[PDB]
Structures are given as C-alpha cells and as structure tokens.
Design a protein around this ligand. Structure first.
Ligand SMILES: Nc1ncnc2c1ncn2[C@@H]1O[C@H](COP(=O)(O)OP(=O)(O)NP(=O)(O)O)[C@@H](O)[C@H]1O
Ligand SMILES: Nc1ncnc2c1ncn2[C@@H]1O[C@H](COP(=O)(O)OP(=O)(O)NP(=O)(O)O)[C@@H](O)[C@H]1O
Ligand SMILES: [Mn+2]
Ligand SMILES: [Mn+2]
Ligand SMILES: [Mn+2]
Ligand SMILES: [Mn+2]
Lengths: 313, 313
C-alpha cells in the first residue's frame, strides 16, 4: 500500500540474502566504510501488483552494518524476518517493525553524510565497550527511490520492549532553556513529555543503587563520546511499563529488551524502565543551518544533559 | 570462475524468487508477450569474491516463460535448483545444467528478435498440442551484461536423458545437398554425426509400429508449424543409449526424459532412443545474411526433412 515501504522490505530482504553468501571476517577494512551496493529495477508490463515498476535501492556500508548487527546480538535472519514477514507500521516519518523490535526513521541526506562522517569512530566505540552502551544502535542505512521520490532511512533498536507496553514516555535534554510539552501535545494518547513535565510532576524512577551507578557510568562515557564528535540535540528517552495497569487490560528478556531496568523492591508500584539515548545525528553546524533558515554548543549540551539525568534518578 | 555464468545463476535465482510472489493466472494477456524485467547491480568496494561488481540482468517475457515451464511439466523451484545449486558445465557456447536436465545456449540479438517474433504463435501451438511436441521447449530467455560484454541466452530441455548416457549422436536435416561429419569431427569423443553417416553406416532405429506412427505424427505437425513461420536449418537430434555398453562401465522416467523411446523386443541390442527437433530460430532472411557476409527455402527444407526421417525409421 505504501510503495516506499514495499521497496524497503524488498531491499532489506535482498541485502540480507546477498550477505548470507558473503564470507564474514572478524574485522572490517578501511574501504568497508566507503562501500555500498546499488540495485536498480525496471519492470515493463510485469509484476504490477507487488512492486512499483521502477525503483532503486542503495545500502550504505553493508559489511559495517552486518558487523554492528552481530555486535548488538542481532542475527541477520532474524533481522530480515522482523522487517519483511509483515509490513512495518507507521506511528521525519517513523515506522516500527511488525514485531516491535526495530525503529525505522526517515532522515535527510545531511544526516546520511553525518552518519558516514562518524561511522568509523562509532564502530570503534562499539568495539571498545563490547556493545554495552546507551547510544542508538545503528543497524542499517538505505536510500530508496520510487518514481521521482528519493528517501533515506536508518534502522535502529527500539528503546522500548517488544512485549511490555509503555504507558508513560519522556524525552529529556536537560536544557537551561525551558522545555515543555505543549497542551495540544499532552492530549495525545502516549504523549512525549519533556524536562519541565518531569521536574513539575515529581516523576520518580525507583531503581536500586547498583542499577543507578551502572547506568550513569554508561551514560557518562556515551555522552563524552558524543561531545567529542560535536554532536547534540540528543535525548534520554524514558519509557515506563506499569505491571499493575498492564494486568488491568511482568518480566522481560534482557537479551531482546536490552534497555530494561526493574524497579527496586520498595517501589510504590511494580515498574520497569526503558531508557536509552536517541537522536544523535545533528552536528552543531547542521543545527545552525536550521536555526538560520527557519551558549548552546556541543560541550554545554553535554553538561546540562548529564546534570539533569543525575538529578532525576 | 566464469563471471557471465555467475550472473546467469544469480539472475535465474532472482527471477524465480520474484515470480514466486506473483499470482499466476491461467491465461496470458497480450502485454505479457512484450514484457520484461531488468536489474542493474553496482557494488562499490563490496562483495568482490562472489559477483562482478557491475552487472545487468534482463529477463524477457517472464510470465510467458513461467507459463511454458508449467505446461512442459516443470516446477519453478526445481528449475531454479537445476540452474543454481551448482554451476552449469560447458560442453555459440553451450552449457548443461549440473543435473543434466537443461541446455543453456548463447544466442544473438537477431535470434532474440526472432524468438519475440514467434513467441505468441509458439505458445498457442504449445497450448493446442497440450505440450506434446518434438519442438524445442523454450524455458527462459535472458540478457547478461558484465563490464562491456553483453550476451543473450536461451534455456531449453535437454533432448537426452538426465541419467542414461548416450554413446551415439546424430544431427539430421535431410538435405538433398550432401551433409557429412568431417574426419576431424569423427575423431571427437561423442561426435555429431550427420545424414551421410546414417545413410552410409546403415544405422537402424528399432522401434515398434505404434511408437513409430505416433512419433512421425507429432513430427509432421511440428515441422508444418515451422514451415508456416518460414523457419529452417533445424535438425532432428538423435541420441542412442546402449543398455549393454552402459553395464560395461536401463529404464527411464518418461516425465523427465520426455523424448525417450524404448526399442522393440526384437532389437539386436537393448537400446533407448532420444529424438527431438533442435535449432529452429534461423529465419530464411537471417540465413541469407550469413550466406552473403560469410531451391533451399523453408518449404523445401520442410519436405526434405520429413522425407529423410520417414526413411530412417
Ligand atoms: N529508538 C527508538 N525507540 C523507540 N521510540 C523512538 C526511538 N527513536 C525515536 N522514537 C520516538 O520518536 C520520537 C521522535 O524521535 P526523534 O528521533 O527525536 O525524532 P526527530 O524527528 O529527530 N525529532 P527532533 O528532536 O525535533 O529532531 C521520540 O520522542 C520517540 O517517541
Ligand atoms: N536441446 C538439446 N539437448 C541436447 N543437446 C543439444 C541440444 N541442443 C543442442 N545440443 C547439442 O549442441 C549441438 C549444436 O546445437 P545447435 O543448436 O544446432 O548449435 P548451433 O550453434 O546453432 N549450430 P548450427 O547448426 O551451425 O547453427 C548439437 O548437435 C547437440 O550436440
Ligand atoms: Mn529528538
Ligand atoms: Mn532529530
Ligand atoms: Mn543446428
Ligand atoms: Mn543454429
């Protein structure tokens, strides 16, 4: 029904099948970070029901993202199934894989240029921390062309659980400038609440001391890495699963819901938290271009961010 | 090892997989005979070991050939396996599928234009006779491009058995002009003998009266159809399996070895014959172009052919 979506599914399927025939070495070479594969399909008076008649599909750095998927505990055949067995659902357009494991976000060519710019350092950071990080997990990046329409997509891991539902959702930046959800926003079903809502509504996260220390430790290293790359406008995405409210209408596989953290035993309510960094691809200069056409530097953003999060936990 | 061969395997695999998702109706529409699918692949700094980095694959009239394959008793998944599980072996270049079921012949763009010209009438002839014919069975036609090299291929059914070996092979035209294998030819392992060899060496085909009548009946209708289309230079390909000689170093599946005919009970030797028409795509005018650059019309060729074959049986 959405032809760009069908091209995406077809393309991911194609990409994973091609890779299944490649010998995967333990290491990446420098050219792997400059690599791509392009397919251009032209059907004349054929197969009109399933696909657009004319489309292109490009995959950036196939070997790097295959390496990353395995590092993030993701098997290629599973990834293929999640994205192609049934269509992704809509919810920058966002889609969620049918099994809720992956997020598919539509991005700009500028974002793509920035992903390329950091991809090597990102990969090496992922190696150093053995894949244990709150950073977005970049799993695939593609360019889709359907009859004059060109779009770029990136695939990442869902911060939230593929099983346990989230009834409350926050997007935190820790800005000295006031951030708040608008009144039209709060009227949404699962609204994206922000820094002021959290500060004002006295939201508490009830996790024990060991879980808190571990989390903030990860968070520190991740955010420094981001600062170092002059990246900003990223958030801590926080999801709360209410085990009680879920029974009205509660444990997780930590190898799938990798961001889950159980509340401690004295929590007023049975809760599971899902917390991770999102939206890192805006470079300082790219934010300035959107502030010109339509104090707050990378390092400051970094400090404000860690201050706020250290406070809210 | 042969990059054109790898593209062919990759392309057939791709084509059959795409078709597996198409709804196949009982009928073909006129546009199906003008249809094609094209794929162009560009790999930059990727997948260098398995495929050329730049290639194109085109399939002519995918729906027609899918229809023909089923009419000829061939399942698409089996066809795919036969052509892609292991490489075709060489033997106009000819290859044989690894399981000896199919012949893959390299043809000219002129041949391709002629196949398109007759494809509708051919299909309708195949419908009328319910697939019971000595004509070549056209199963797929493709264009391959690998770095400046463009080639066209047609896939047909092997005349000979996929199991039982052939120790003697004839190529008969029935020309009033003398046809003979040369002395350098007879020195080949499995030589392609011709009209004079057969007449001179008193070769006999020992088949009973019912088998002979049925065969010549089919042959008559097939050759008239060919004459009608002004086609010529085609042969009766005759293969002889010696059951005795085969035991030194004998029955067949008639649903796979569709051209097999057992000898009668009084045959001097246990023999199985494999006989069918081959090489039909030379149009009268196309033969004249190769007679100019480097009596014998279509109807005469037709008469000479049926006279000779009626004589040899
Ligand atoms: N990895 C993820 N898992 C689950 N939900 C996500 C994820 N990424 C984004 N979302 C949801 O999508 C919303 C917007 O994500 P984001 O990537 O910040 O979009 P954006 O268009 O870049 N917004 P902006 O901050 O204006 O640039 C978030 O608040 C989440 O509700
Ligand atoms: N369908 C088939 N099954 C088995 N063997 C075949 C088949 N088609 C061709 N061959 C073999 O390949 C040889 C040449 O086939 P043919 O298609 O006549 O080639 P060609 O290059 O068109 N020859 P020409 O007659 O000079 O145009 C035959 O004599 C057979 O030995
Ligand atoms: Mn954001
Ligand atoms: Mn953003
Ligand atoms: Mn011939
Ligand atoms: Mn020929």
């Amino acid at each position: 029904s959405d032809p760009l979506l069908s091209v995406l599914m077809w393309g991911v399927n194609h990409s994973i099948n091609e890779l299944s025939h490649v010998q995967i070495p333990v290491m990446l070479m420098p050219d792997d970070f400059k690599a791509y594969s392009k397919i251009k399909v032209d059907n004349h008076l054929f197969n009109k029901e399933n696909m657009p008649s004319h489309f292109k599909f490009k995959e950036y750095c196939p070997m790097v993202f295959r390496n990353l998927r395995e590092r993030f505990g993701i098997d290629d055949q599973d990834f293929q199934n999640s994205l192609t067995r049934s269509a992704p659902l809509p919810n920058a357009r966002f889609h969620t894989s049918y099994d809720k494991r992956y997020i598919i976000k539509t991005i700009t060519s500028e974002d793509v240029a920035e992903m390329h710019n950091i991809l090597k350092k990102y990969h090496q950071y992922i190696v150093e921390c053995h894949g244990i990080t709150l950073l977005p997990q970049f799993l695939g990046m593609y360019r889709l062309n359907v009859d004059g329409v060109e779009i770029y997509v990136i695939v990442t891991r869902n911060v939230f659980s593929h099983r346990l539902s989230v009834y409350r959702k926050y997007d935190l930046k820790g800005s000295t400038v006031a951030r708040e959800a608008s009144d039209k926003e709060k009227a949404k079903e699962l609204p994206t609440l922000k820094d002021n809502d959290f500060i004002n509504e006295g939201q508490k996260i009830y996790i024990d001391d060991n879980n808190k220390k571990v989390f903030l430790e990860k968070l520190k290293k991740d955010v420094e890495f981001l600062a170092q790359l002059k990246l900003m406008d990223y958030s801590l995405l926080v999801g709360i699963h209410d085990v009680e409210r879920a029974e009205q209408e509660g444990e997780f596989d930590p190898n799938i819901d990798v961001y889950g953290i159980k509340c401690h035993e004295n929590s007023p309510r049975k809760e599971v938290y899902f917390m991770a960094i999102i939206d890192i691809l805006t470079h300082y200069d790219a934010k300035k271009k959107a502030a010109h056409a339509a104090t707050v530097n990378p390092e400051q953003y970094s400090k404000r961010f860690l201050d706020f999060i250290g406070h809210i936990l």
